[PDB]
Amino acid sequence: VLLLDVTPLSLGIETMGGVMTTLIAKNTTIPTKHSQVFSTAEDNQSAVTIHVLQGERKRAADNKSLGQFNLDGINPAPRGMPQIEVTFDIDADGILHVSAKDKNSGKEQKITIKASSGLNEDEIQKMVRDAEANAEADRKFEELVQTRNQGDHLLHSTRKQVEEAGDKLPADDKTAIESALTALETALKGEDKAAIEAKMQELAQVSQKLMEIA
C-alpha cells in the first residue's frame, strides 16, 4: 500500500524460432499464476524443452536464462496436437514455479527458481533501455520468425495433402509442387523473409488443384 512487489521484467519460455513467449508480464504484482497450453514442433515428438527466460527482448538468446527442464513421455501424435500446459506461479515469498503437464499422459516436470535468481537492479535498467533501443530489430526478427513458421506449416501441410491425395494428383501438378516444396524448405534454411514469401507464393500458384482434392 506504500509498496509493491512487482516483476521488474517479463518471464516466459523459448518457443519455435528462438522467440521468448511471455507467461507473466513486466510490472505484474506478486503473488501471481499464469498458464498457457503449448504443443510440439514435429510429428511423433516424445519431449519438449521448457527454456525459462527473464527479459524484454523478442529473441530468446538476448534474454536472461533462469534454467531449463525436459518433459518426456509425449505419446506419438501429429505436431500441434498434444497439450503441454506451462504454468508460472510466483508465491508471496518471491519463488517462481514453472510446471509443464501433458494433459493426455498426465505427466509433469517442475523447476523452482530462487527469488534471487536473474538480473540485479543494474542489468534490469540496461535490459529495458536495450529493448527500446531494438524495438525495430526485434519487430523485424519477430516478423521473420512468424514468416518462417507460416512457411514451415505450409510445407508440412502440403506434404500430408499430397500423401492423402496420392494417385488423385496429375503427374504434372505433383512435379511442379515437388519442385516448389524443395525450394521452400531450402529458403526456410535462410534468413531472407522475401525469399521465403516468394517460395510460399510459388506453392500457392502451383497447388490450386491439390487444394480442391483436399
Partner: peptide, 4 residues
C-alpha cells in the same frame, strides 16, 4: 505455439 510449439516448443522444440
Amino acid at each position: 505455439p510449439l516448443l522444440g
